[PDB]
Amino acid sequence: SMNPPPPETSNPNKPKRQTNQLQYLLRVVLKTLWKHQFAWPFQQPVDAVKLNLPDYYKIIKTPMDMGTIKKRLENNYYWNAQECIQDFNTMFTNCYIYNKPGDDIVLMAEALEKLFLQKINELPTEE
Numbered sequence: 001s002m003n004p005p006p007p008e009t010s011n012p013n014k015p016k017r018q019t020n021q022l023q024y025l026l027r028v029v030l031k032t033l034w035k036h037q038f039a040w041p042f043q044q045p046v047d048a049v050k051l052n053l054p055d056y057y058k059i060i061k062t063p064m065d066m067g068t069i070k071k072r073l074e075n076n077y078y079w080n081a082q083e084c085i086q087d088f089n090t091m092f093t094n095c096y097i098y099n100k101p102g103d104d105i106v107l108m109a110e111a112l113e114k115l116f117l118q119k120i121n122e123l124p125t126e127e
């Protein structure tokens with residue numbers, strides 16, 4: 001089935017700010033996860049057309065990915081760190097919902113999620 005448009009990444013009507021926590025989420029968390037050997041399926045929206053997954057967006061109605069998260073952080077789309085953390089969590093949960101436990105893609109997500117959690121544990125205090 002057709003892909004949906006990717007998630008919104010810029011909103012001129014949405015107020016903006018820079019915080020040490022958002023800067024960390026971009027320069028440490030996103031960067032580190034991006035470079036991980038298992039990152040590639042998570043670096044862009046799931047192309048369900050190319051992958052022949054006609055039911056993907058019947059099941060997943062809140063898609064998310066790290067390509068989108070990168071843009072959101074760049075465009076100061078987020079007011080707070082929790083919005084961004086929520087997007088990462090959504091990204092992983094979608095993968096877990098659509099797939100069978102122990103599947104390759106799930107082991108890949110679990111490793112990335114482990115690393116994510118280790119990094120957010122070291123989220124700096126809001127300065």
Ligand SMILES: Cc1cc(C)cc(Nc2nccc(-c3c(-c4ccc(F)cc4)ncn3C3CCNCC3)n2)c1
Binds near residue numbers: 099
């Ligand atoms: C042949 C092959 C094998 C593997 C292991 C991966 C891929 N490529 C690829 N690219 C983007 C997505 C997925 C994917 C996802 C998925 C879901 C959510 C998310 F955030 C990230 C990924 N969930 C399932 N998949 C596929 C669907 C077809 N069967 C393999 C898993 N797979 C291609």
